[PDB]
């Protein structure tokens, strides 16, 4: 149904609808920017129920029902994730997240570690980069310039952003991925706008030195958007973190080779003490 | 100091000049920029290495660019013409030839009706027909020229970025901020010219008649480049009876500008033994 998430510095209460399923293990994923909590659906939950686990899925700030939430930082997002696990009686819990996701994955282990037993960090990053930052702002002067993509130039932006050089080179592939979009419409709102934010402002890999528990980072070999460097620098930092790299999958791996990072999480989870 | 030389007549019965450029006096090569490119973009780094090998390099403004910015409903064949009439006017028949992109498209065709007229080529970045991506990559391009909605400095720069250069490059802070910067000095302007350049390109399967190109080529793939992926070069020199194919590594699409060195050096080895 829906959990309450924190109040937001202009005193408002906020409801988060979340999704659960099955019996066991606890794990809750966090979406990347744009990302509803269906986005697990196609992909990870189906393989995380057949492993034994309990899924929770949920709408972040700014997606869906809070499309138009704004003026949030990554830690209202954080507070929110804390919200979730404690008013589900599930810490410490097993976390997923991917991209904006993983950020708060991250930020929540370094104020909550209690709240989490073990990560799976994936297209991630502790700090940006010249060049995520200046995609960063471009993005940001997009939307504040209101200024409308049309949508076929809207398609091949998220096309070259999100997969592989393989996907793009296969005419099968690369069909399905587009059809693909129609179903998945990115609605470009105050909350879109807000998750951009969401993001480093510093370097916070000191502050990760600090996080205990174990953790998977995944890299994705053509990932441009996060790219891999930046999410080995994550598992450097992190004392009980292990690195992995996808080969040929772009920053939207865990949808492009959902087999080779399923395989992957599962095998890291089992491995891991609940 | 002004070198204009007469292309082909448009449908309008129209006489059109266009700006060169012709400095050396060794072995002739013909350059011929990428779609939105003028003459000048081969200077900061072919240029000067061609000549400091003893060739006469030859640059030029593409029809769309520059004085003929707002020139339109021109094709391949028209631009096909206008390199022959550069070559024509300036009696360096048969030429060596490097294009890159749009304009490795247009030495290809040059080779397929005017075959005498291009002792050898280096074709860089460059396919004989469009995959689903690449199709889907330029009817994208033309809807947002078509639609009339101007994207954002900033946000163009990172398409720029992203477009066209190696995961290498990206991930170097101090590259990456001169390339930001370089931008600047040479924006990219919306034009007729520009739109119509778009539709310069592979309409059909071209491999087939490329099968009968006798010159040597050496063809160019540049590993990263998302914009024609290397292996579309490599069909072009497949296709190709005396063509080679040579893969740059960590260069996006324009390899050119940002592995300068690797990419001269494998052009003059190549030209250096040619027939």
Same mark, same amino acid.
């Not at 990932?223 to 939207?252: F, K, W």
């Given at each position: 149904?829906?959990?309450?998430?924190?109040?937001?510095?202009?005193?408002?209460?906020?409801?988060?609808?979340?999704?659960?399923?099955?019996?066991?293990?606890?794990?809750?994923?966090?979406?990347?920017?744009?990302?509803?909590?269906?986005?697990?659906?196609?992909?990870?939950?189906?393989?995380?129920?057949?492993?034994?686990?309990?899924?929770?899925?949920?709408?972040?700030?700014?997606?869906?029902?809070?499309?138009?939430?704004?003026?949030?930082?990554?830690?209202?997002?954080?507070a929110?994730t804390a919200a =979730?696990i404690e008013? %589900? /009686?599930? #810490? @410490?819990?097993?976390?997923?997240?991917?991209?904006?996701?993983?950020?708060? +994955?991250?930020?929540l282990?370094?104020?909550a570690?209690?709240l989490?037993?073990?990560?799976?960090?994936?297209?991630?990053?502790?700090?940006?980069?010249?060049?995520?930052?200046?995609?960063?702002?471009?993005?940001?002067?997009?939307?504040?310039?209101?200024?409308?993509?049309?949508?076929?130039?809207?398609?091949?932006?998220?096309?070259?952003?999100?997969?592989?050089?393989?996907?793009?080179?296969?005419?099968?592939?690369?069909?399905?991925?587009?059809?693909?979009?129609?179903?998945?419409?990115?609605?470009?709102?105050?909350? =879109?706008?807000?998750? %951009? /934010?969401? #993001? @480093?402002?510093?370097?916070?890999?000191?502050?990760?030195?600090?996080?205990? +528990?174990?953790?998977?980072?995944?890299?994705?070999?053509?990932?441009?958007?996060?790219?891999?460097?930046?999410?080995?620098?994550?598992?450097?930092?992190?004392?009980?973190?292990?690195?992995?790299?996808?080969?040929?999958?772009?920053?939207?791996?865990?949808?492009?080779?959902?087999?080779?990072?399923?395989?992957?999480?599962?095998?890291?989870?089992?491995?891991?003490?609940?």
């Amino acid at each position: 149904l829906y959990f309450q998430g924190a109040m937001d510095p202009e005193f408002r209460v906020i409801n988060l609808a979340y999704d659960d399923n099955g019996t066991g293990d606890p794990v809750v994923f966090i979406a990347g920017r744009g990302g509803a909590g269906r986005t697990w659906h196609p992909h990870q939950v189906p393989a995380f129920l057949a492993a034994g686990y309990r899924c929770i899925t949920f709408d972040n700030r700014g997606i869906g029902a809070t499309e138009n939430a704004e003026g949030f930082t990554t830690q209202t997002m954080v507070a929110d994730t804390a919200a =979730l696990i404690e008013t %589900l /009686d599930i #810490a @410490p819990a097993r976390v997923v997240g991917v991209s904006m996701g993983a950020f708060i +994955a991250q930020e929540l282990m370094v104020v909550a570690p209690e709240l989490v037993s073990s990560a799976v960090l994936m297209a991630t990053r502790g700090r940006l980069d010249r060049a995520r930052q200046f995609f960063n702002k471009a993005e940001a002067e997009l939307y504040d310039s209101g200024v409308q993509l049309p949508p076929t130039y809207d398609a091949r932006a998220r096309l070259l952003e999100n997969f592989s050089r393989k996907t793009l080179n296969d005419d099968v592939a690369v069909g399905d991925w587009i059809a693909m979009f129609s179903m998945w419409p990115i609605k470009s709102t105050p909350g =879109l706008r807000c998750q %951009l /934010d969401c #993001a @480093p402002q510093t370097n916070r890999l000191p502050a990760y030195r600090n996080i205990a +528990a174990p953790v998977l980072v995944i890299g994705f070999a053509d990932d441009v958007v996060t790219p891999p460097y930046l999410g080995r620098e994550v598992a450097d930092a992190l004392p009980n973190g292990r690195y992995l790299q996808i080969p040929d999958a772009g920053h939207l791996g865990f949808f492009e080779r959902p087999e080779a990072v399923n395989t992957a999480m599962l095998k890291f989870f089992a491995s891991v003490k609940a």
